[PDB]
């Protein structure tokens, strides 16, 4: 009689409804602490795992459909509870199923306040501090990327996808900008670059762009799963013998499944020679030039022009936090702008080159920079080197462990350069018949059938996928501080017992 | 003590850091419980107005520089405080600012939820709730929209800019799939057609997906800022005339400026003739269609093609929550699909029709859903209807207030169709008058002057803008349901006080 009684159009902006605001927000903060609370307990499931159609019928009776009428605010507080009830615990040690996982509370506090402050990047007039803040901490990544203070520019953008979609609109600005007013038929047939091992992200920006698939290029991978530079000059040479225009490489700089790192250098060399753009997704690497032991991996980003970069991935900023660094500055203005009305606005009393608005693909924009700029000052570089390093060794440490075992069988002849750990789990059964197309058929439904028990025990959760000719194999990942050893021994042992119960 | 030799990494998930992390999060909240009952409170101001320089120059024990070494919990709360101390209130009563404004309760803690659960919408692997959440709410939408109750299609997008960008890739890949594979020189000269007061996203959509910006052909419109539907259909003759191939129309639907609404009948008319694709920007006017009363401004939209409609807008909820809705199912999906490693994955144990992120220009997707579905919960249909249609009334209001008074003009002859109410303050020195060049540029630079004396006391907070020919005139807009009548007075008279000043 006290919440059940009460309703949304009670609460503030409603005549002193301060007092029932503030205790409905703590009563909701209440129920989002015991969630955080549970999160780190590893007696906890990952997931009460349900098919969509289960959720669909009431369970139980959780109620998604909606009505005319409003619900009660007590109601509205039991479905913050059964929400976060049905929902997978990313935050999980044991979560190891995607490239983010983990839940920093001081991003979570960013968030928290990000969402209070309810505010649009586009101009300086409305969001003056998180303008500066991310002006600030754009041109610190750009000085860890290496780039010089002379030039430089950059924006947050909603996920890494749109990032690389922003680099390829650039690389294009730069070298035809007349495709801006006349279309890219007005052009001739430009043609870009990127492993086949890179990200979809690129084939889809090209589909997107006018490029059409046919004409993003994939280059060759070596055993490792890295660019084979000869391959990538070799498509070049073919594309300009055959009056083809080539403009732009993505490397990547950690790739999705491997791990594997691109020989940016190389690469680079052979851009400088042949003028092309030289874009490096480290969207899932970009976590490492954190670390002094370990951006060697990246050497010859300092060489990009530009660079795709998700502290959401290794970092563990909350979703989305992505970044596109560009080292020539003007290139997104020049690319971007519609000076429309009305937004953008030069007789402001304040320096309009603030409303950075203009040289986005958005118009209303998610402030994405307070969550990761507060996580920057609560734990210093030296912070995110810390958990970077311990993430890597307890990869390491995996991969030793699994590596000469006639239980698993490794995806790739070489070290992880990266937290990606690649492997089959091979039943007693499969173990030496050997190697066959037979073989292949079988082992390529182990993944599916041990991921389908995890998610029912709901113990852990790890991704699976094919590539190539290869079969369906584990992706082991790591990024959450809150994963340990005993996690991983965990876990070892839980695709064990797992492989021994196939028959359902 | 108590902060002072605290960290970050003394907290969750370090070992012993449960009752550090609760407390913690709980004096966050403390400050944020503090900014919420301020936001309401009129006795504030809605912003405390800084040049970039002065804030970058040092604001006392706040520094925006990042270092090696950690700040201690206490200065990580005092960020937090200073943060909020220096930004702009958009929940205020008298914050005019945008087309978003205010700060819905149910929406603020849906989004502290959404946080916590911090999750991607591409699977229902990981998103199962949320994902269901969608699709129940989608198609809600379309039934609004008056589209059929089954099939049908849409997701949630970053933007209502990019919601547009989506309904240009879908009508592309229906009417032209090769350009997928092939790009656009494979299909020369397709033209899209948008109003000339039409959102700038249709002409940043139109250059980054190849089209040029010199084949996004702009419709005349009239005095009330309408598309004249004429004009659409010569402009159309026009471009296949010269061996253009036209296909899509941008209809809005309440526009940014003006609040116009499209004739979406008489161009559905004029598109079903031709062939043409037909969009509806409902970005803006989309929250009408809540009300009986007023949705039939968008009457016609039952025939469109694609609609994009921006809940954040109009029916309040918390940045970013927009749509875009497709009348015909598989367009996306055929148009954006890339079918990947990775994940995706079709040999699942669930059916993996309820993944739905290959339909998505995104990969990885923010949960922009809760928060509204949650908002749906605790208002019902009748709680946004009865929101919209008071903001609608005041707009009226202010309206009558202002239109047969020397101190200020009507920038067009017309009443208000949405909440946005467009005039120019007149000094007395421009009474009366006659319109030249000469006086124009007097007049531009009134509206500015009175905008930056607004930012300087902080009292409110209201847009201005030029369009075509027509010097800069303010553009009130009503979207805060904290927005009472006496507020609309306040910045009336604070405009005429500034006005000679």
């Given at each position: 009689t006290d919440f059940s009684n009460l309703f949304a159009r009670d609460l503030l902006p409603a005549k002193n409804g301060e007092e029932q605001t503030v205790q409905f927000l703590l009563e909701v903060v209440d129920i989002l602490l015991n969630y955080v609370r549970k999160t780190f307990d590893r007696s906890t499931k990952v997931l009460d795992f349900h098919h969509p159609h289960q959720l669909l019928e009431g369970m139980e009776g959780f109620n998604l459909e909606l009505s005319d009428h409003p619900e009660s605010l007590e109601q509205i507080l039991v479905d913050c509870r059964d929400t976060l009830k049905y929902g997978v615990r990313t935050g999980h040690p044991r979560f190891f199923n995607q490239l983010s996982t983990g839940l920093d509370i001081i991003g979570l506090a960013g968030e928290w306040l990000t969402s209070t402050a309810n505010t649009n990047m586009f101009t300086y007039e409305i969001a003056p501090v998180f303008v500066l803040m991310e002006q600030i901490t754009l041109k610190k990544m750009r000085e860890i990327v290496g780039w010089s203070s002379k030039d430089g520019d950059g924006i947050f953008s909603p996920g890494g996808a749109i990032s690389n979609m922003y680099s390829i609109m650039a690389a294009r600005y730069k070298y035809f900008p007349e495709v801006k007013t006349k279309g890219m038929a007005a052009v001739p047939k430009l043609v870009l670059?990127?492993?086949?091992?890179?990200?979809?992200?690129?084939?889809?920006?090209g589909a997107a762009l006018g490029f059409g698939t046919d004409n993003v290029i994939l280059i060759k991978c070596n055993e490792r799963g890295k660019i084979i530079p000869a391959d990538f000059e070799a498509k070049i040479l073919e594309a300009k013998q055959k009056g083809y225009v080539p403009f732009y490489v993505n490397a990547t700089a950690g790739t999705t499944v491997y791990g594997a790192f691109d020989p940016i250098q190389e690469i680079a060399d052979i851009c400088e020679k042949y003028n092309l753009w030289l874009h490096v997704d480290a969207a899932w690497g970009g976590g490492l030039l954190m670390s002094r032991k370990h951006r060697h991996k990246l050497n010859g980003i300092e060489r990009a022009n530009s660079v795709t970069w998700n502290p959401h991935k290794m970092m563990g900023v909350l979703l989305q936090c992505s970044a596109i660094l560009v080292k020539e500055k003007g290139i997104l203005q020049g690319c971007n702008q519609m000076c429309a009305g009305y937004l953008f606005q030069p007789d402001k009393q304040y320096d309009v080159s603030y409303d950075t608005g203009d040289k986005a693909i958005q118009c209303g924009r998610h402030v994405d920079i307070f969550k990761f700029w507060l996580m920057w000052k609560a734990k210093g570089t030296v912070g995110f080197e810390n958990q970077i390093n311990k993430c890597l060794e307890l990869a390491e440490y995996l991969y030793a462990k699994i590596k000469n075992r006639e239980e698993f069988e490794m995806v790739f002849n070489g070290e992880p350069e990266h937290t990606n750990v690649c492997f089959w789990y091979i039943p007693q059964s499969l173990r030496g018949v050997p190697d066959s197309p037979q073989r292949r058929e079988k082992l390529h439904k182990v993944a599916?059938?041990?991921?389908?028990?995890?998610?029912?025990?709901?113990?852990?959760?790890?991704?699976?996928?094919?590539?190539?000719?290869?079969?369906?194999?584990?992706?082991?990942?790591?990024?959450?501080?809150?994963?340990?050893?005993?996690?991983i021994d965990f876990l070892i042992e839980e695709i064990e017992r797992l492989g021994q119960d196939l028959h359902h």
């Amino acid at each position: 009689t006290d919440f059940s009684n009460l309703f949304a159009r009670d609460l503030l902006p409603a005549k002193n409804g301060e007092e029932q605001t503030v205790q409905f927000l703590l009563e909701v903060v209440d129920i989002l602490l015991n969630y955080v609370r549970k999160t780190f307990d590893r007696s906890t499931k990952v997931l009460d795992f349900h098919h969509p159609h289960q959720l669909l019928e009431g369970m139980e009776g959780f109620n998604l459909e909606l009505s005319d009428h409003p619900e009660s605010l007590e109601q509205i507080l039991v479905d913050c509870r059964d929400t976060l009830k049905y929902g997978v615990r990313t935050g999980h040690p044991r979560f190891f199923n995607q490239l983010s996982t983990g839940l920093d509370i001081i991003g979570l506090a960013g968030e928290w306040l990000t969402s209070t402050a309810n505010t649009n990047m586009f101009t300086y007039e409305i969001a003056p501090v998180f303008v500066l803040m991310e002006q600030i901490t754009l041109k610190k990544m750009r000085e860890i990327v290496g780039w010089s203070s002379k030039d430089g520019d950059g924006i947050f953008s909603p996920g890494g996808a749109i990032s690389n979609m922003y680099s390829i609109m650039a690389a294009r600005y730069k070298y035809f900008p007349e495709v801006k007013t006349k279309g890219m038929a007005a052009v001739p047939k430009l043609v870009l670059f990127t492993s086949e091992q890179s990200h979809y992200s690129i084939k889809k920006a090209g589909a997107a762009l006018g490029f059409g698939t046919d004409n993003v290029i994939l280059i060759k991978c070596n055993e490792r799963g890295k660019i084979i530079p000869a391959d990538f000059e070799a498509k070049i040479l073919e594309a300009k013998q055959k009056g083809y225009v080539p403009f732009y490489v993505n490397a990547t700089a950690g790739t999705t499944v491997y791990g594997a790192f691109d020989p940016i250098q190389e690469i680079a060399d052979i851009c400088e020679k042949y003028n092309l753009w030289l874009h490096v997704d480290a969207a899932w690497g970009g976590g490492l030039l954190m670390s002094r032991k370990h951006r060697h991996k990246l050497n010859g980003i300092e060489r990009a022009n530009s660079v795709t970069w998700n502290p959401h991935k290794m970092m563990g900023v909350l979703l989305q936090c992505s970044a596109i660094l560009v080292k020539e500055k003007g290139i997104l203005q020049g690319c971007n702008q519609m000076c429309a009305g009305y937004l953008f606005q030069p007789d402001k009393q304040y320096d309009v080159s603030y409303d950075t608005g203009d040289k986005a693909i958005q118009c209303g924009r998610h402030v994405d920079i307070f969550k990761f700029w507060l996580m920057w000052k609560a734990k210093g570089t030296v912070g995110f080197e810390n958990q970077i390093n311990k993430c890597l060794e307890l990869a390491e440490y995996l991969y030793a462990k699994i590596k000469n075992r006639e239980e698993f069988e490794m995806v790739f002849n070489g070290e992880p350069e990266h937290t990606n750990v690649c492997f089959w789990y091979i039943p007693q059964s499969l173990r030496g018949v050997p190697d066959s197309p037979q073989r292949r058929e079988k082992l390529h439904k182990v993944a599916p059938k041990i991921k389908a028990l995890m998610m029912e025990s709901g113990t852990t959760m790890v991704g699976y996928q094919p590539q190539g000719d290869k079969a369906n194999f584990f992706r082991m990942v790591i990024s959450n501080p809150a994963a340990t050893q005993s996690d991983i021994d965990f876990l070892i042992e839980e695709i064990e017992r797992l492989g021994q119960d196939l028959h359902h």
